[PDB]
């Protein structure tokens, strides 16, 4: 299947308490492999997956340098945004960045991303064509004009299609054993009466990778997708994920329901009946 590389960064300003807190993480698919935390001891980019540890000291130096540089420009970005919006210097603000690339099954470029949020909302994003920017407001319009004049997009696009893709192929190769695994969900059903007339049917999916999955309930053959409670996919901590979906059924009617599981790891979707 497709694969992805992502870097996420967050800077949170803390006026009166020093410089912004800065945290960056790197992912291949749903596997974290690197991190940097401004409040941690090393002040280095650090490994978080075994297959990245084999990279030499040049790698760690270059990556540390780039991530630190990014934290510094983030600091200035926070100041500038304060000017653009005329916001008080007493308020804490958040700057988020996502960057990365998607490749397909044989490793060919699929997509590239470079986008920013300010205080939880879209600020500026590289468009899918990798040739221009979407600015979500007027401040971001200022930034957008600057980046057009600076010709940032040519560099970013070339980086996305070249360096990012080659990096992703590299990582996928070195982390072969773990990253190219697909783990099908182990499913089951539980029954919890809530009264003399009402019961809860709960369909569970466990031990699966990658994290993307679909869990649906249907009565006879018709979806129940507004009567289904559906919790957020969660990490087990072992590299796999967990999810469940529940429906309330009339006592005696349990046998009418089916749970359906769609996952990349299954040759075919599952149908489960009580």
């Amino acid at each position: 299947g497709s694969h992805s590389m992502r870097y996420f960064s967050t800077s949170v300003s803390r006026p009166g308490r020093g410089e912004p807190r800065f945290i960056a993480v790197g992912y291949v698919d749903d596997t974290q492999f690197v991190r940097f935390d401004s409040d941690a001891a090393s002040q280095r980019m650090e490994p978080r997956a075994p297959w990245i540890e084999q990279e030499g000291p040049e790698y760690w130096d270059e990556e540390t340098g780039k991530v630190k540089a990014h934290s510094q420009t983030d600091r200035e970005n926070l100041r500038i945004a304060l000017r653009y919006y005329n916001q008080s210097e007493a308020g804490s603000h958040t700057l988020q960045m996502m960057f990365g690339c998607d490749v397909g099954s044989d490793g060919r470029f699929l997509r590239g991303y470079h986008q920013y949020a300010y205080d939880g909302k879209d600020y500026i994003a590289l468009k899918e064509d990798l040739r221009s920017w979407t600015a979500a407001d007027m401040a971001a319009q200022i930034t957008k004009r600057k980046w057009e004049a600076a010709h940032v997009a040519e560099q970013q696009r070339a980086y996305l299609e070249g360096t990012c893709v080659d990096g992703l192929r590299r990582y996928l190769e070195n982390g072969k054993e773990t990253l190219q695994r697909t783990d099908p969900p182990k499913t089951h059903m539980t029954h919890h009466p809530i009264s003399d007339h009402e019961a809860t049917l709960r369909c569970w999916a466990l031990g699966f990778y990658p994290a993307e999955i679909t869990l649906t309930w249907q009565r006879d053959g018709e979806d129940q997708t507004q009567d289904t409670e559906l919790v957020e996919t969660r990490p087990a901590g072992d590299g796999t994920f967990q999810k469940w979906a529940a429906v309330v059924v009339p006592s005696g009617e349990e046998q009418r329901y089916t749970c359906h599981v769609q996952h990349e790891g299954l040759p075919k979707p599952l149908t489960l009946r009580w």
Partner: peptide, 8 residues
């Protein structure tokens, strides 16, 4: 590989 980044 971490990206290079530009000021706002």
């Amino acid at each position: 590989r971490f990206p290079l980044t530009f000021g706002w």
